[PDB]
Amino acid sequence: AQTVPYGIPLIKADKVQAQGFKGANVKVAVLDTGIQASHPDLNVVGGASFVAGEAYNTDGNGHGTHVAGTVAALDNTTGVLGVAPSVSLYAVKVLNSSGSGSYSGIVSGIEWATTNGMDVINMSLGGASGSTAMKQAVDNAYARGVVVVAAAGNSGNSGSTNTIGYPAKYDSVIAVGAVDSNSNRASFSSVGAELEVMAPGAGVYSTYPTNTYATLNGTSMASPHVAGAAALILSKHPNLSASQVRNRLSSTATYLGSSFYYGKGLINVEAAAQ
Numbered sequence: 508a509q510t511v512p513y514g515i516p517l518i519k520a521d522k523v524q525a526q527g528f529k530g531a532n533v534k535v536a537v538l539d540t541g542i543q544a545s546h547p548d549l550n551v552v553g554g555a556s557f558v559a560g561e562a563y564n565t566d567g568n569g570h571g572t573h574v575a576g577t578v579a580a581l582d583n584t585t586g587v588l589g590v591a592p593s594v595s596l597y598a599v600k601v602l603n604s605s606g607s608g609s610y611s612g613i614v615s616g617i618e619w620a621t622t623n624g625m626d627v628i629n630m631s632l633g634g635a636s637g638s639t640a641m642k643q644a645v646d647n648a649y650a651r652g653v654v655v656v657a658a659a660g661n662s663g664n665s666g667s668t669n670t671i672g673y674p675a676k677y678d679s680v681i682a683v684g685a686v687d688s689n690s691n692r693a694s695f696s697s698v699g700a701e702l703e704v705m706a707p708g709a710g711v712y713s714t715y716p717t718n719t720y721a722t723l724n725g726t727s728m729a730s731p732h733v734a735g736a737a738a739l740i741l742s743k744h745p746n747l748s749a750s751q752v753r754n755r756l757s758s759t760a761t762y763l764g765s766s767f768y769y770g771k772g773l774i775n776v777e778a779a780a781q
């Protein structure tokens with residue numbers, strides 16, 4: 508009855524989980540379209556909503572719910588298995604039903620997250636431009652010790668140009684690209700100097716409203732693999748700093764090719780969590 512999405516062992520999260528580290532006590536905020544809190548495979552401990560007319564524990568789009576499931580679907584006898592199934596999960600709603608958000612809404616969510624003591628923030632969202640306030644927000648979150656992860660973008664490549672979106676592009680944020688179950692880069696994955704690591708992003712099955720499970724493709728889906736990993740690292744080495752966590756992830760990554768399309772490569776949690 509429980510399905511193991513291929514991304515889990517592809518990043519070796521399963522080997523870490525078997526060590527006894529599952530993210531217990533680590534706080535992760537999912538900055539997204541909200542989360543279907545009543546899903547039986549998810550346990551949402553709190554959150555906030557910065558979108559008018561929608562509470563934070565409903566997901567009318569599904570995206571938030573799916574991203575969250577990759578970070579933390581419960582390890583049990585049903586549904587799927589998250590990368591860090593015991594993490595304390597918060598839903599922070601910054602995107603509307605249609606999957607879009609405003610700058611001030613996103614910034615508010617980052618700030619909330621920093622203020623409320625999150626350890627890791629996941630932002631499967633992004634655009635062609637940033638804002639100064641957005642930059643301030645992210646830089647400040649990192650400086651205070653939160654690991655900040657974002658999807659690089661689903662723009663593919665074109666010639667020698669950078670298709671890395673913001674906030675991923677900021678240097679205090681990890682930009683994650685997508686690979687498929689064969690470990691190959693997916694075509695839609697953005698490219699650029701800032702790309703940092705890769706994770707599973709094509710054909711990712713996860714939680715999905717209402718009470719079901721579905722497969723989506725996107726750097727959006729690769730991002731939470733990284734957030735979940737950081738969370739595992741922290742549960743095994745609580746003394747680490749954000750940048751140390753960041754460093755472990757990119758240094759032990761599996762090389763796949765040039766950094767412009769693959770950054771340092773595919774994350775390897777077992778290696779990173781040593």
Ligand SMILES: *C(=O)N[C@H](Cc1ccccc1)NC(=O)[C@@H]1CCCN1C(=O)[C@H](C)NC(=O)OC(C)(C)C
Nearest residue numbers: 605606631632633634658659660661672725726727
């Ligand atoms: C996750 O993969 N998020 C990706 C986009 C992204 C961009 C920059 C940095 C990180 C991630 N966003 C989406 O998939 C997003 C959700 C709701 C709309 N959607 C779009 O960007 C769609 C695909 N674009 C769309 O509206 O463009 C048209 C229809 C042409 C106007």
Ligand SMILES: [Ca+2]
Nearest residue numbers: 544545546549
């Ligand atoms: Ca539930």
Ligand SMILES: [Ca+2]
Nearest residue numbers: 581585586587
């Ligand atoms: Ca489950």
Ligand code: NA
Nearest residue numbers: 681682701703
């Ligand atoms: Na980056």
